[PDB]
């Protein structure tokens, strides 16, 4: 679950 980078772009 590589959501680390994903969160920076999508959520934040």
* Side-chain half-sphere CA neighbours of 6 within 13 A: 4
Per CB under 6 A, the list member of 2, 4, 9, 10 interacting with ligand LNK is 4
Backbone angles phi, psi at 10, to 5 degrees: -80, -65
Q: Does 9 bind ligand LNK (CB under 6 A)?
A: no
Q: Does 1 bind ligand LNK (CB under 6 A)?
A: no
Minimum CB distance to ligand LNK, residue 1 (Å) = 12
Calpha distance 11→2 (Å, rounded): 14
Query: Which residues of the shown chain bind ligand LNK in the complex (CB under 6 A)?
Result: 4, 7, 12
């Amino acid at each position: 679950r590589p959501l680390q980078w994903l969160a920076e772009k999508y959520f934040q």
